[PDB]
Design a protein that fits this description.
This is part of a larger assembly, with five copies of chain A. Chain A is mainly beta. Chain A is built from three helices and 22 strands. In chain A, strands 1, 3, 8, 9 and 13 form a five-stranded antiparallel β-sheet that branches. Chain A has a four-stranded antiparallel β-sheet with strand order 2-10-5-6. In chain A, strand 14 and strand 15 form a beta hairpin. Chain A is globular. The relative contact order of chain A is 0.21. At the A-E interface, strand 1 of A face helix 4 of E.
Chain lengths: 372, 372, 370, 372, 370
């Protein structure tokens, strides 16, 4: 009783280690396409069915021309992170894993790297290191009549990390394809007029109505483990890792009122590793000034980290070495995931100071859950 | 002897029922694109490889501008049903299933619904039901200088129905993609000049030469069964259903002469569920007045339903609650499919009263046949 | 699993009852009144045999006393003659508790066409809207009086052949309660610019419109002459111990481009879902919505569709579209049944959200009396 | 030892034969587009995933108007072969096969046909055979104010030939698309001014600056084998054929000096079937007069065919029944492919007589190599 | 396989040594000179304990004596103050033999950020480039003198915790040799249009630039007070019998759109690979390359990537990009180890190839003293 799982854990970990030691990691291009967003913006990519799939690195480039006669546009807070609006992955058994927004996926990529994802840090080095290759790049502004070039990368995870295969997918089933759906930005989502909500946009400004994509291009690279190890009983595989879902999902909630605790409940069964809360205060994104405090509480009137916005931000600076954009708040629960079974119902709390019309909290979650 | 098939039938039906009871039906978007027909009109869609695929619901919208200085155009008899010129589906084994015209597919969608496909019936209800959502819609005329908006839907079937999986496709083979090819209308097929054949066109009239598509957009939704049931021997599956092809195909035949029986033979092996015959009388489509009678005969000079056009139309009114467009004739053989093996050669007969130059019969068939 | 035996028996008993008993539809009560004095009535059904449902006939005369302005039917029109209905069985257990408009939309969904409507055809024989079964003037001009007729079927049994949800009333003397709340001079007329959701007419002359009177007649449908056997009455015990109810609710908190999820409760087997997008008093034909869907936690959407494609599925069910802003979902063959509260939710991702926006939900479900 | 490969060879050949005998060859259109080069010239075609893919026949047509007021333009030596500037193919595993110039691909098409690709030979026949269909065609000159029409075809090979499936691609992986990238000529590459380098151009002359494409159209036809044969162990397939790459690639080298051997080394591992060397003598293309001799040598100061230009050309006349254009030299090593492992390093040699400024050798190779 | 026992023992011994000995960093030699007279020096390390590596500090003053033209730092700048380094252990066996710039890039790869750099932050407290640890003027104007400082870590041991490659020098009196070749007036300055690969400054005034002087100080890092046991010194025999070396090479023969493959040798366990595309003196930010990869014969590529995606992997390793035309590949967790010469190769498929193009390779590897 319960000892069977203690054994299962060791067997799973043992097999994970053997797989990591014996297999060979491969990153391979699976598809590349250049398109005009005016014609199409939704694509369904069919990755290869080889060994254990760890994730996908998605490269996105775009050329945007601001055709306005006189006005410019400037990057929104999320900018190129909004080149992909939504990403959804389905495994060979047609089970959904990650299903979230490009901006949420990007903030998690940053959280897991411990710094702005794939960024180039600035130093005093006289040797010419720096932003040489423009891996993630977008012009701060695009003047009237100008064309800007952007590059963005997203890592869509299946496995939790390079050493923790929890969430990985065994794609060996012939005739049963995986599916990576990408819903890209287009001329209706990428450009926000002055005064409009910039949340999902790339550029905002007085020239927005005349901005257009010349083209968008994407290349999907699939990362997997080949040459899987075989034993007496055949393929040595961490069964728990491969039967666990590691997913990112987002949601929206409204109903905030000044000085009243707004509580977003965590669902049961899911083990929440991180939580992101974006306070879209009716299109306004503020640097903590519209919030009294944020917290996580296990009901029973018990906060584990009720903090003023600046102190909450301080905890985040310890995790990613900088602040997330205005109105974006992060919470790390990786070592002790929020799990309602072992702590009772828990909720994420925001007590707003100021609430504009159409205010809402956009939540992003990272979690583990059993397939069955 | 022959008892093996009697058992196979029961096993197939039993498994079909288990699959229907245990699986979960899903309808999911697989691709959406907006394009200019002047640049391209043929697309190859790659659907997802998940479980048992039942069919595809294809949404098509378009904006058409009549740039003529003075003349209008009016819908042809088929109208928006001609937004898709041809549809062809190939399964993972690269076997062709349906391969037909958009107009034929649409008439079969109507026949199987028992009323004009996805239409809104008119009633005396004071409550505001009606054509609220314009699911299938097209302006009757497009004036000189005006732009009309159209919406059309087609159901491309694999399975015969929601409860009869005959024809369904098991798409689990990784690396073996299905293919749904769509050949859309364009500026050369959609607009017929006065006096030209309107068969494949959407609009016809004195302003036709100056009509053009501003754009066409399509969205393909895939309907399938997920969470397939497993048993002692693995996946429980109706092997006969999944190894049978349910296809729609069309053809053209010429050589008609006044008062002489024009006979179109049914091929052997195929089990014909329905037959559609369109009398394209050299570009003229008449309401039965150019026909003496229609029939189905098992050779051996034996008609099973030799009828005058109005009486033939009466049988059809019992099936779809109205008449098909001028010159379009329908025949239901669903309960007792035409099968040459069990009745000898059979043919569809039209004895024309009047025959114009370039007259021909366009035939549309719905049938079941064995993969092997 | 002695369930197979229970279900097998239940079904057999149902068939014997349908085969042996005789259907009766009988008037139980009629009343005429002035909404200015009263609008809530508690009808007492007859306690006889197995009760299947109630057909409620409502007629009304509305006078537009305005000097010069007319009013016109709202989208729901006469379907708002009854604002709410509640039914309590002899054991004090509630079955349906919903709005008149939701009840009407379910009546339509179950018929497969606008409830009790007259279809238009090319027939030269004079079939047509001869009897004005459900009827209301499109407009009532200043100084005019319009006559309206509306019918509602309050179901207990699921259908004429499926007695799930039916009520055995030959039982105790304990009374049934069919509560009806009718429209009144405060709910039936909406001023220009006001929310027309619960109103019958809207327009410039609304402030001066009033009911001349309202009348209702309730007909009770039941099975009499129940079959008897060895142990006694042959009865489908599962059918009679199951509740078939319609219920409504309201949810708010919608935000542009964000998924608004209405969770389904556990225990209930949801047969259909209706969601009305009351966009701050505006009712649009899908243009204010990105998509609708039904989703299971950690298994994504089973039918995420654009508004027109969602409407296409509905056209296959009722042969037309429901009124603007009204969305229907059929789950009859495979009822939504979570087992865990919220394992499944109804989703609406709005494109535009006005002030005071909300989703008015309507549900049809089965649940055991437990 | 080494005997396993001798068996593998026989198994591979046996399966190849079964596949050829049992499958059915199909050539099918996959995409057609008409475009204005001023708007776009690079396209990425997604072919169908059916059976074993042998190659693609690409039809290209164009209308070119010479808007110059007074001067004409004339075809360059390569002419319509420069309608496609570069072609690159990627298989489902995202592995690159052919990656070369349109002119190189065309010269190889010619070499493998044994005569100018898809040309019409001239004979004394009184029966009206001849250039009836203008399969590959381009007007010799386009006068001031005139519009010329061109047609060009390229065969992009995967399989080596119709009977040798070495290089063919198994495209059955659902969700893993192949990609055929075509970079077409445009108004900046197709027209060379007098004195400019004509290498990549279609027309050259005094009216070049005013020449423009009215349009370019392409149609890609995919050739493949359907109805693949199945055996006890499933699909019978030549594993060596399908795991070998048959590619064409080109490169450029400079640093030539009069009377000094210019040597271009062959890389190891690749089995080189043919070599093409184009002596772009600073924009001048001469009929051998700027070369002392050409050769192939296995280092160790050992030439296997050191020949004067005319004698080298004589060997080529035996292969394609005519000469390649000025400055284009061909070498057939099909029966005994250049392989550095079995002969040591080998190089292609050109000893120039005259060397202009900006001289270079453009090399084109045809080769086989292992995927792994 | 008594290897498990050997490795188990080696690792235990390593831990005892790290736990029991004491780390020392000590100056072994300093010298100031004029490159016009000499630029090659052979430093003699101290023979004490287990030697882990050498920290080499180099300072220089450069005078631009040109009348009116300035010069500016090349991409490598002060990293070219040392042209080459070679280390010989007491047994006459060579370990590292590479260029100063390759050594510097590995120092950066191992640190996970530009070696000994000062990161810029928003801190109001005055942290920053206070001490100019690695520093050089961006430009030196005509008539000006600039002061430069550069540091290099020549490793023997792989890291502070992994003694693989370390050298036992308490052993024989036989001397160690740390050979250093410094930049001189012929290598440090590149004229406009000349190849700047090995230079520190390039520009119109280059011909008249010269070193005023160069100074170096070598610090030796070692472990003293080695632990003794029964048989004597407790030592990780595998660590001390393994060589951890950096080496460079040059390859030519690149052709547009053709795979250029640099084979890896057998026996060596390659931890990292650096490839510099010296495109005839031009250094581009990936625009002259189609893709890079690592490939095994008859098993295709394990990482065929476009230049930007290749750079993305590097950004995860050093938090920025290496200079233009410099490409890095980390194989630390699973070192390239062929067993058969050339079973694995490093691939570069160039888009454009200029005259005198070549790839300058740099490797980090482990190999047994055999």
């Amino acid at each position: 009783a319960a000892l069977r799982n203690q054994q299962a854990m060791a067997a799973n970990l043992q097999a994970r280690q053997i797989v990591l030691q014996q297999s060979y990691p491969v990153i391979q291009q699976v598809e590349t396409q250049t398109f005009d967003p005016a014609n199409r913006s939704v694509f369904d990519v069919t990755p290869a069915n080889v060994g254990i799939v760890k994730g996908f690195l998605v490269k996105v480039t775009a050329a945007i021309t601001n055709n306005h006669a006189t006005e410019a546009v400037a990057l929104t807070d999320f900018g190129p992170a909004n080149l992909v609006q939504r990403v959804i992955y389905y495994d060979p058994d047609n089970q959904r894993h990650t299903e979230t927004s490009g901006w949420h996926l990007h903030f998690v990529n940053t959280a897991k790297q411990g710094a702005p994802f794939l960024s180039s840090m600035v130093t005093d080095s006289p040797i010419k290191y720096g932003d040489v290759m423009n891996v993630i790049d977008a012009p701060a502004t695009i003047a009237a009549g100008a064309t800007g070039e952007l590059t963005m990368y997203y890592w869509v995870p299946l496995a939790y990390s390079e050493t923790d295969l929890t969430g990985a997918v065994l794609a060996n089933v012939p005739q049963s394809k995986q599916r990576l759906k990408l819903e890209f930005a287009n001329n209706n989502t990428a450009f926000a007029a002055v005064g409009a909500n910039p949340l999902e946009a790339i550029y905002q400004g007085a020239g927005a109505a005349d901005c257009e994509f010349e083209e968008i291009s994407y290349t999907v690279y699939q990362s997997y483990l080949d040459q899987l190890p075989v034993g007496q009983n055949g393929y040595i595989l961490p069964l728990i890792d491969l039967s666990t879902l590691y997913n990112l999902e987002n949601s929206a909630q409204a109903g905030l009122t000044p000085n009243v605790d707004f509580v977003v409940q965590y669902a049961n069964l899911y083990r929440y590793l991180s939580t992101i809360a974006v306070f879209d205060n009716g299109g306004s994104f503020n640097a903590g000034t519209d919030i009294n405090y944020l917290s996580q509480r296990t009901a029973n009137f018990s906060d584990t980290r009720k903090l003023d916005p600046k102190t909450w931000a301080a905890q985040t600076r310890r995790r990613i070495a900088t602040d997330f954009p205005k109105g974006v708040y992060y919470c790390d629960n990786r070592d002790k995931p929020i799990y309602t079974l072992q702590y009772g119902n828990v909720g994420f709390v925001v007590n707003p100071k100021t609430v504009n019309q159409n205010a809402r909290l956009l939540m992003g979650y990272e979690y583990f859950t059993s397939r069955t």
